[PDB]
Design a protein around this ligand. Sequence first.
Ligand SMILES: Cc1cc2nc3c(=O)[nH]c(=O)nc-3n(C[C@H](O)[C@H](O)[C@H](O)COP(=O)(O)OP(=O)(O)OC[C@H]3O[C@@H](n4cnc5c(N)ncnc54)[C@H](O)[C@@H]3O)c2cc1C
Ligand SMILES: Cc1cc2nc3c(=O)[nH]c(=O)nc-3n(C[C@H](O)[C@H](O)[C@H](O)COP(=O)(O)OP(=O)(O)OC[C@H]3O[C@@H](n4cnc5c(N)ncnc54)[C@H](O)[C@@H]3O)c2cc1C
Ligand SMILES: Cc1cc2nc3c(=O)[nH]c(=O)nc-3n(C[C@H](O)[C@H](O)[C@H](O)COP(=O)(O)OP(=O)(O)OC[C@H]3O[C@@H](n4cnc5c(N)ncnc54)[C@H](O)[C@@H]3O)c2cc1C
Ligand SMILES: Cc1cc2nc3c(=O)[nH]c(=O)nc-3n(C[C@H](O)[C@H](O)[C@H](O)COP(=O)(O)OP(=O)(O)OC[C@H]3O[C@@H](n4cnc5c(N)ncnc54)[C@H](O)[C@@H]3O)c2cc1C
Ligand SMILES: O=c1ccn([C@H]2C[C@H](O)[C@@H](COP(=O)(O)O)O2)c(=O)[nH]1
Ligand SMILES: O=c1ccn([C@H]2C[C@H](O)[C@@H](COP(=O)(O)O)O2)c(=O)[nH]1
Ligand SMILES: O=c1ccn([C@H]2C[C@H](O)[C@@H](COP(=O)(O)O)O2)c(=O)[nH]1
Ligand SMILES: O=c1ccn([C@H]2C[C@H](O)[C@@H](COP(=O)(O)O)O2)c(=O)[nH]1
Ligand SMILES: [Cl-]
Ligand SMILES: [Cl-]
Ligand SMILES: [Cl-]
Ligand SMILES: [Cl-]
Lengths: 213, 213, 213, 213
Amino acid sequence: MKIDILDKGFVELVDVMGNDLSAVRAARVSFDMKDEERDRHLIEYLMKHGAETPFEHIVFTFHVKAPIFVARQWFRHRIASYNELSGRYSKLSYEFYIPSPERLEGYKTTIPPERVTEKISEIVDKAYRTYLELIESGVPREVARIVLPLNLYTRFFWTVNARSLMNFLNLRADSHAQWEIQQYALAIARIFKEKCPWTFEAFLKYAYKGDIL
Amino acid sequence: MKIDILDKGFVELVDVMGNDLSAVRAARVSFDMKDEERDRHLIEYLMKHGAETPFEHIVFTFHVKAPIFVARQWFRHRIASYNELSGRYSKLSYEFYIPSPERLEGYKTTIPPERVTEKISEIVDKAYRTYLELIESGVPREVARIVLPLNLYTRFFWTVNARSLMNFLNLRADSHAQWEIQQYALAIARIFKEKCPWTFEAFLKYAYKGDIL
Amino acid sequence: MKIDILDKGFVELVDVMGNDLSAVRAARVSFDMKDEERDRHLIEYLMKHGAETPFEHIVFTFHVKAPIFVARQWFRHRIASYNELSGRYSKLSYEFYIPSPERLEGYKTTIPPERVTEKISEIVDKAYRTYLELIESGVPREVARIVLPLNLYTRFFWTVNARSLMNFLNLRADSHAQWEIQQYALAIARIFKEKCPWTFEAFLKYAYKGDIL
Amino acid sequence: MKIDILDKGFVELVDVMGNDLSAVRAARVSFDMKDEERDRHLIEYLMKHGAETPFEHIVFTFHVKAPIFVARQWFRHRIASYNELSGRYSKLSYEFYIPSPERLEGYKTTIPPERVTEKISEIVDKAYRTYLELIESGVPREVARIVLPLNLYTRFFWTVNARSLMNFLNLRADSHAQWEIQQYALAIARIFKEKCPWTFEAFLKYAYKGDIL
Ligand SMILES: Cc1cc2nc3c(=O)[nH]c(=O)nc-3n(C[C@H](O)[C@H](O)[C@H](O)COP(=O)(O)OP(=O)(O)OC[C@H]3O[C@@H](n4cnc5c(N)ncnc54)[C@H](O)[C@@H]3O)c2cc1C
Ligand SMILES: Cc1cc2nc3c(=O)[nH]c(=O)nc-3n(C[C@H](O)[C@H](O)[C@H](O)COP(=O)(O)OP(=O)(O)OC[C@H]3O[C@@H](n4cnc5c(N)ncnc54)[C@H](O)[C@@H]3O)c2cc1C
Ligand SMILES: Cc1cc2nc3c(=O)[nH]c(=O)nc-3n(C[C@H](O)[C@H](O)[C@H](O)COP(=O)(O)OP(=O)(O)OC[C@H]3O[C@@H](n4cnc5c(N)ncnc54)[C@H](O)[C@@H]3O)c2cc1C
Ligand SMILES: Cc1cc2nc3c(=O)[nH]c(=O)nc-3n(C[C@H](O)[C@H](O)[C@H](O)COP(=O)(O)OP(=O)(O)OC[C@H]3O[C@@H](n4cnc5c(N)ncnc54)[C@H](O)[C@@H]3O)c2cc1C
Ligand SMILES: O=c1ccn([C@H]2C[C@H](O)[C@@H](COP(=O)(O)O)O2)c(=O)[nH]1
Ligand SMILES: O=c1ccn([C@H]2C[C@H](O)[C@@H](COP(=O)(O)O)O2)c(=O)[nH]1
Ligand SMILES: O=c1ccn([C@H]2C[C@H](O)[C@@H](COP(=O)(O)O)O2)c(=O)[nH]1
Ligand SMILES: O=c1ccn([C@H]2C[C@H](O)[C@@H](COP(=O)(O)O)O2)c(=O)[nH]1
Ligand SMILES: [Cl-]
Ligand SMILES: [Cl-]
Ligand SMILES: [Cl-]
Ligand SMILES: [Cl-]
């Protein structure tokens, strides 16, 4: 499962361990212990009571392409594993997030939204040109990259269990989160739902704290 | 894969996500990047330099049956997920770890090792008899169980990534750890080796800190 | 601050870093930023919205004496630091939790609550006698202790931040938790309230999930 | 204690809990247990054997001003607490890290190091000018800031225990880490040494893995 996000981003599921029954088993190993009706009720019971440790036995790995300002927010989720493309080690690609003019809907601006779009493209092009000039002059990559803007795309692998994923969705699939990461959270939710439908529906009904899903 | 440990214990692998190539990929997503020779060298490189985050993308779930004193030590490993049979909720089974007389090899004792074995069996039988008397009298399980000894068997599910597993092996597959948990660690190592042979061999060669493997 | 718990237990505050203003500062370093009215409102704002990271900058260390079955439950809180008296290394003291007859109020039993109390004392005395016999015969401590019951007292140091402490109180200062750990949680709450009154009151009003405080 | 880093950065100690004796106590609560000679030997013993949990009972809070590319690397240390100035919420200040010409010593470049310095200043000035134009036109701050470069200064509070701090120093006070974060790590080390001299010296002698301290 792969989902395009923003203008050049994506979220892709690379691997998964377990399913809804993984949580039911782990939880049962407590009672020294059925059928779809009872196992689904147990999932709802756990979710209703905040007994979320059993969901840690469901694990996902995603490959994500996102702008640096989005990745900065995402990487604040400490209960997870990350490995990210390095600007110290690699030549960084010319790929930037340019907001669509619709991104400014609701805001009165004193320059046209299409001109905001152009101004962002222009500065990012100038910054990349400076970056490449520095690189081609023999400046180390790790220094050259410091002129690149926060809308540069980066890529990372993310391994996260279902409990920590539900925390991420509470926080990022929510109107208070920046719109850009919301869009990534909606994609993560769609994949979670596909892989763990009983857990996801129980999450939405009983535990999900956000206002978008 | 299932392995008998001690007199009545076991370690069983329930599920696994990923393999040696999972770490190679995750690490490559850094260099914006081969073949078995190069991928194996990368694993050794990571291990040699303590660059262990890529191994967090390999995850295991085990089902473990072990005495409570072993589980107490094991559950000190915080970077992992656990769910354990409950004495508050369930009637606990009559199953205790009784050391073999060989457990005392090296120790001069003033009672015969076979008599130590009998004395342990006798007290555990008396404790269980009291437990069952309390339960059958209407004492709540969560109170009745407090008379049961630390050699009572318990069971748990353990979900752990390969980096945290390597930490566990450093500490528990080692002569300083109690012999009983060492035996469980040897089983965990055998399963890790089977599932992740390049990572395991690189671990032993370059990073493993213990003295048994 | 020290508080007696159960028959022989205690909770003592050893050290603390920070106060209510530590969370206000840390949070302000977000807005590049007052007075008691505004700082108290900010605390309530954070608590109301689940924005709890600023409370991680308040840290406590406690010294706790508790029975092993209580410590087993407590040590499940992974987002904290522990060091505990060892039965491998030390001769363990004759100190056991014996429930009061009032512990069984609400339960119809077919033996008198005072006789349950005596039966627990009797088995614990027999177990300790076996332990000491094994120790005095030259059995290693780490093996001898396996006959000791779960109501043996142990001691530990616990270092925990205020966010993780609030999680502990949600779970353990609650009717669903075993009564014995509830009593320890009530003591932890009393100390937290004394040290962080604005945070504590905001916690109770807006975020606390339990039913006892 | 406050230390200037780079051209406009700093590291300041805001608060601390505990000292070398905090680790000695916590560790002793294991043996159910002296003087400066014995307590210092215990610290060395723990460090020599990797028995580092007792050092988690020493905790620091720092206030750090650093460029975003440095903060991105720093915030990868998950076993710690962070709160950072927000570009969604605040107008960001015109403050950028401009490397000194000495930063390029060892590198043959085909433009003079002083001209690299000027090219970096020029692009950062243009990016900030665009940022301010967007802000003053009514573009939301959270969108306007995406044009700002990675050498923008940010500020954060960091609360970290001594074990996690030692991990940070292993990784960041080391020639493999980017020079800029090395400079911050050297400052963190100087403060750690001042506050915990026995732990620090034992760390350097027995456990420190880097090549700078
Ligand atoms: C709308 C919004 C605005 C934000 N604004 C800012 C801002 O201005 N500045 C800023 O710095 N950050 C900001 N954040 C980031 C925020 O403070 C969190 O870092 C982020 O939401 C991750 O949440 P988390 O800690 O629950 O997740 P994780 O770090 O994944 O932790 C998951 C859970 O584990 C626990 N946990 C993990 N580590 C610890 C620990 N050390 N102590 C206690 N419990 C722990 C907690 O229960 C936590 O919920 C903002 C986030 C949101 C959604
Ligand atoms: C021979 C031996 C004797 C022992 N004796 C005692 C004893 O007498 N008393 C006792 O209480 N315990 C004892 N232990 C337990 C020991 O203190 C550790 O709790 C256990 O070994 C788990 O190690 P860990 O913290 O590295 O693992 P985990 O808790 O799984 O942590 C893994 C890694 O994550 C990091 N980490 C996780 N949480 C934190 C945190 N909060 N702060 C900083 N870093 C963190 C560290 O890098 C750590 O190595 C003993 C263990 C051994 C092997
Ligand atoms: C009434 C009651 C009955 C219980 N019954 C049982 C039982 O029968 N069997 C049993 O084994 N346990 C049982 N528990 C223990 C329970 O499953 C938890 O281990 C314990 O409550 C600690 O909760 P916690 O994980 O939130 O705390 P911590 O481990 O301190 O974690 C704090 C927060 O950090 C986050 N976190 C930390 N580590 C991870 C991780 N690896 N993945 C995702 N998020 C993480 C979560 O947000 C978590 O809330 C019971 C607890 C209660 C209160
Ligand atoms: C020279 C250098 C180059 C780097 N290059 C890259 C790169 O190219 N791309 C990139 O993404 N990152 C890179 N990093 C970052 C690196 O991968 C680590 O994220 C960073 O060094 C923090 O290390 P840590 O995980 O030990 O620290 P923390 O996250 O603070 O963890 C401390 C300890 O807790 C344990 N721990 C915590 N969480 C877990 C977990 N979930 N599972 C298992 N154990 C855990 C481990 O024992 C760990 O050592 C680089 C770092 C260095 C120093
Ligand atoms: O919605 C937010 C706002 C902030 N942050 C974290 C990420 C950065 O570490 C820091 C500043 O982020 P920005 O506000 O500049 O995006 O706070 C988030 O995680 N999410
Ligand atoms: O080898 C050891 C010794 C101790 N402990 C931890 C587990 C308990 O929380 C506490 C006391 O354990 P025992 O020494 O009693 O096994 O310290 C271990 O994890 N491993
Ligand atoms: O209320 C509870 C019940 C269980 N457990 C955890 C602790 C043990 O690891 C395991 C079994 O505990 P008991 O039910 O036997 O107390 O589950 C708790 O933390 N709290
Ligand atoms: O020395 C390094 C190199 C990388 N990273 C982490 C931080 C970012 O999340 C990602 C890319 O960092 P840069 O290589 O671009 O600095 O990897 C570090 O923490 N330290
Ligand atoms: Cl390109
Ligand atoms: Cl039985
Ligand atoms: Cl005694
Ligand atoms: Cl300014």
